Design a protein around this nucleic acid. Sequence first.
RNA 1: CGCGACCUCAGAUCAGACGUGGCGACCCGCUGAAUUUAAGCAUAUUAGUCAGCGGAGGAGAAGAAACUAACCAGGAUUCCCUCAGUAACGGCGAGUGAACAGGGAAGAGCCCAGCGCCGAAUCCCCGCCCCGCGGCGGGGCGCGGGACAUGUGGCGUACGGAA
Lengths: 86, 122, 119, 50, 105, 53, 203
Amino acid sequence: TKGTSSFGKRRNKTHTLCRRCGSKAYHLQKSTCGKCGYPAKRKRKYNWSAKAKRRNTTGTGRMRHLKIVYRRFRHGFREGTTPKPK
Amino acid sequence: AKIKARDLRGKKKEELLKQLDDLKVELSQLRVAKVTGGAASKLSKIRVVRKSIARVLTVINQTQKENLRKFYKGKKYKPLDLRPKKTRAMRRRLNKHEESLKTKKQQRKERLYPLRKYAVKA
Amino acid sequence: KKIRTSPTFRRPKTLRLRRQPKYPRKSAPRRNKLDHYAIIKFPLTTESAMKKIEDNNTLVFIVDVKANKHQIKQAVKKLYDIDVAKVNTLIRPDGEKKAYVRLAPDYDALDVANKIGII
Amino acid sequence: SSHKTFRIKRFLAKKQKQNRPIPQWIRMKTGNKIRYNSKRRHWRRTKLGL
Amino acid sequence: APSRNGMILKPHFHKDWQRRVATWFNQPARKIRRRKARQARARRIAPRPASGPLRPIVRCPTVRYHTKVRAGRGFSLEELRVAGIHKKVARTIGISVDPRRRNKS
Amino acid sequence: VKWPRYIRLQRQRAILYKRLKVPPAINQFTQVLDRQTATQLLKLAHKYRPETK
Amino acid sequence: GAYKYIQELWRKKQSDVMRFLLRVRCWQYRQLSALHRAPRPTRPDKARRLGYKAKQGYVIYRIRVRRGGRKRPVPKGATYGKPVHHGVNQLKFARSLQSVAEERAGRHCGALRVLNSYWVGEDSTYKFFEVILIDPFHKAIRRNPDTQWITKPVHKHREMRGLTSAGRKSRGLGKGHKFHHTIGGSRRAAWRRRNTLQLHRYR
RNA sequence: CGCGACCUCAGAUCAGACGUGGCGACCCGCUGAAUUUAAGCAUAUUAGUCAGCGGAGGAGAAGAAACUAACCAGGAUUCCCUCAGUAACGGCGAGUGAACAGGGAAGAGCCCAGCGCCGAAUCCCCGCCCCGCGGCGGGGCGCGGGACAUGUGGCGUACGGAA
Ligand SMILES: [Mg+2]
Ligand SMILES: [Mg+2]
Ligand SMILES: [Mg+2]
Ligand SMILES: [Mg+2]
Ligand SMILES: [Mg+2]
Ligand SMILES: [Mg+2]
Ligand SMILES: [Mg+2]
Ligand SMILES: [Mg+2]
Ligand SMILES: [Mg+2]
Ligand SMILES: [Mg+2]
Ligand SMILES: [Mg+2]
Ligand SMILES: [Mg+2]
Ligand SMILES: [Zn+2]
């Protein structure tokens, strides 16, 4: 009864998609993620799981804004200027 | 049929808006032709029209922002987008006038006892 | 000599001024990205859509998901110079918004379909 | 479920659009090492555990 | 386990010492960087001595040595007064001055 | 009236100052100059007011 | 001046005048919230000695902190381990209560920066401190060379990192034989120096 | 019976700014064990270590003696060699364990409160004029405001200072 018969009545889900980390870990009743802790301002991470930190770190994503910062620093963060016109 | 920014620089704003409207109408007609079979020649014009629209909008935005920052050139308070955007920390950096600022004690010390040039063994 | 009629002390209503900024937060207002051309993507030319146009005197278009029925009606009116009776919209199981545009009895859906090019 | 929300419907639509096979003309490219999609999802196994 | 007359040894390797091992492969690069910095500093002050300000004569405490003479931190204020050099002027001409040093002898 | 906490505090501190045995160093300032001498003092002080802006 | 007299008066706390004033102030402060802005320094001389200056951009806050030690944050017993670490009640926090008040003042006022704090009163269950804060972006502070050092980013949250006067004492750093620790940057710097195996290339 | 100053305390879609989060190899402040060793084990050891929390920079922290020494004295802080597996600590068991001096790398000193003298001689904000203004400054013209005598600025701080 505790085995195959019990697996039949898994009808209602307890987790949904979190809107901050995107993972299916948002607990419906507690309204807490447990993967990133969305209601908490700070992101959830720990030093006892280094692989988890490596999975979601700065280099993993798009880096849409930081990649431009790298080149802008590499040239000198110049603003409001144009190259010599032809 | 090529649209170049050189000609668009001197054109008036209303002419650029009319050209943008014509390009958008052509793009809509190109989409209609695309979903009705069309042809390779018709389908290859979609990218050309999209890039022409992008060029027209880029010219419009550049001219508008240049005029706007010309207007605010001199005012103490300016819109945030017109302010220089270096970095979060670099905007919190000192004003470059207070760094050169020296107290009267420091100026007295430097004036009274400046660093002098000297040599030995003679 | 103002008597305290009630034993409760509530916060008095003080004067509050309307915001009068010295400078605008941003230089220019954002241009709308949902113009009459962006809302209407392309008409649908399927067999079901063709029968719908021929019989129900309607038009079938693919619309941006963010558009409302009022926006669709106004966009069709401005684009094709037509008057719309009603609009029925749905979200297809692919992410695109599909709208049935019922035409007024004065105009014919077949004629405007021929004019736009779909047949 | 016929009572889905907008986010779930968008997710399902994106998965359905991604389920299509690889076009043939990709194989004719010079530097190509791909033979099949290898990410096809069927609705009997790999039940998309939302 | 001891075995037929070895020394009684107590190695200090009971902590996680492998976590804090400091290698010295940086030594030649460090020496080159120090030499480059020294040469650049010498070039910056073209006529001034590269070593720096003059150092005083100092005798060492701790009767072990009791006889060697080394360079001090700076000349005391009494020495400057006897020699006739202002304490604030002296540091601008290349003379080391410190105000903590006493003068017993 | 259930007054706000600051009004009750500022009244109760005066009540405590009345209740408690105030040492003479603080109690000295309770003895203040009378009105007739105070107005003459102010009349003399108004003549020697310091230069303002 | 009057500041010398004020300091000498404040040194005689056991006197009737000072004890009466302290009792009245303690009652008034106990009737207020645990953290609220004080408009003027209660002790101008102490504030001046600690670095407060009567200029725009200088702010003080009065903070109330519970007295006593720190019991172990555990359930009823549940100090699982050797009986050495069974201590729960009679264990004390390394940092002082004044540093805790400075930390709370800095935490509440993230924009402001804590300069120093001083003692104004204490009860059996409460202690009251006045924490001096400086606005790092006020033109009266930026344009003054003597006070523009605190505007630099290296001085963010001094109380959190134990750089204030109250927080510096808990670090146990100083010159002489009586410490022999923090003889580098801090306790951990000395520990790292003494617990590293310097393996040279030629050994 | 109302008005006028002051002190404490509220309201703002009031004018102009600031903090929030991320990374975290290196750094600073807390909290903080048990595996293990002692051939058992409770003090010890593991170990101010891992785990947990908070806070920055390109370095951080520290730093110019309420010092070291007892010598014919040295002279801020930081790091390297040595001191030294030493003085010392420890069911004096297992084990733990620095500092001074010496040789080097580098080397840079200073500022307040108080004490006192100068008519607040000081500072912030808003208007106009001139320069440059894309790390918003300088000068002048404003009986235009505010902060400040419950103390701003100039001289001046232990090596003495002021007249
Ligand atoms: Mg001064
Ligand atoms: Mg199944
Ligand atoms: Mg040297
Ligand atoms: Mg203490
Ligand atoms: Mg054992
Ligand atoms: Mg064993
Ligand atoms: Mg065992
Ligand atoms: Mg221990
Ligand atoms: Mg420091
Ligand atoms: Mg030393
Ligand atoms: Mg030896
Ligand atoms: Mg003064
Ligand atoms: Zn999440």
